[PDB]
Design a protein around this ligand. Sequence first.
Ligand SMILES: *C(=O)N1C[C@H](NOS(=O)(=O)O)CC[C@H]1C(N)=O
Ligand SMILES: *C(=O)N1C[C@H](NOS(=O)(=O)O)CC[C@H]1C(N)=O
Ligand SMILES: [Cl-]
Lengths: 241, 241
Amino acid sequence: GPKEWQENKSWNAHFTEHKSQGVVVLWNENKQQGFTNNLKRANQAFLPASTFKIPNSLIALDLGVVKDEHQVFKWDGQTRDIATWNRDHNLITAMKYSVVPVYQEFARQIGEARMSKMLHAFDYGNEDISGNVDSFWLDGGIRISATEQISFLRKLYHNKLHVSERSQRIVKQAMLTEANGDYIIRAKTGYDTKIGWWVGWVELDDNVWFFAMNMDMPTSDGLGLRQAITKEVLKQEKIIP
Amino acid sequence: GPKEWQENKSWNAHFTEHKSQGVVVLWNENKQQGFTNNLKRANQAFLPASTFKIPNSLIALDLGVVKDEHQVFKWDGQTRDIATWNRDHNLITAMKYSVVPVYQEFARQIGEARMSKMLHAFDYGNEDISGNVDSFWLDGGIRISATEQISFLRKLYHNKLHVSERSQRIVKQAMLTEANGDYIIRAKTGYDTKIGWWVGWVELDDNVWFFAMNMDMPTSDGLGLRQAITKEVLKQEKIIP
Ligand SMILES: *C(=O)N1C[C@H](NOS(=O)(=O)O)CC[C@H]1C(N)=O
Ligand SMILES: *C(=O)N1C[C@H](NOS(=O)(=O)O)CC[C@H]1C(N)=O
Ligand SMILES: [Cl-]
């Protein structure tokens, strides 16, 4: 019989070209088949860092902490290192610019009991929120693997998560990253100071490819490699031109 | 004091450069002010042609004629001149490739009584569905102006049309045309053998610009000028780079 999961080590060339190491995991939805350059690392669990703003957004919307994607979260007046954070935001721009202080406020309003119950209902990673209610995805006990990211994203794509369909549609809107006549990418980046993430999917006319990548990332200087390397794999597999 | 609509005839150079004539209408949502090169033509009502796929989609979804944006509508097997039409489609690709036969079947299932009632509820153009229920937007009595297109699109953007929020969110997803780190365009083209249309909006971080353009289109050779001329105006107004 055919294999659900296949290893393709030729993708390592795209990491080695940049003196880095990592994993790309792809899932072909039509074929129900997955592909990766590193089967073991594909299933190892890491801190989600800013990719947690996908479930955080879903929970905040479903609970009414965030009313809709137009509600304004005012800047608290503290000047931070990332210039795009020093302004008012809504859900769309807070995800686009990965605005930490806005999502810390969401997490505090959600609170520990409801955050834990929702991640259990999502089957999200190891479901463990130990640590600070407003930072556990960066320095606490939650862990998720690349294959677990894909499983979560597939439920989101199909509106199968336990939260309202409305919440799922709003977050999928907020994940929009790039679109043209050839493809649509909905995705979210993350960085925990050691590992960089990019997770999401590529919508084509007749198929959707889910992806989850992480890579060793010692400094923020190489952050654009997250998208660049993933796109090299997508080009090799003839998913995008 | 300032006027709701300002005329900017310098945009005519973008039509003149292509030996063409037409109108571009812009609406700045934050400032609640509009701009056009031709106020008279901005209020001239034309057949909507394929821009009618926006209200048609909304009605089909709200009535359950279309269950969701993934439902597949099989090719009926008749070979038509536009090759992308000769295949199975869902709502996303039917709007992307402007697949008339799919939308003709939606319209027949909606039926004239519900179609007329919903266009009245939408305040859509002259609300006149005289002709065949499956072709009145191509060769019947319905007429809509560029400013009326803006009015309709503003209601859709704000979820204020008399259909479910869900239907409006799905259609706005289906209108997605282009997205990058600078802007998002949601829009729909149309062509009636005499006039070409492009209507929609540009989402920025902190504003939305609605647009509706139409131009004289004697042959199909110049159809790419609908987007190209509109983008020259957007570039001149520093809405997009
Ligand atoms: C999330 O991982 N973080 C917030 C912000 N996002 O940048 S990313 O999306 O481009 O990686 C900066 C990195 C990180 C953090 N420092 O908390
Ligand atoms: C809609 O106006 N039509 C369907 C199709 N779409 O072309 S467009 O979207 O690029 O203008 C072809 C033109 C037109 C029609 N023939 O009815
Ligand atoms: Cl979208």
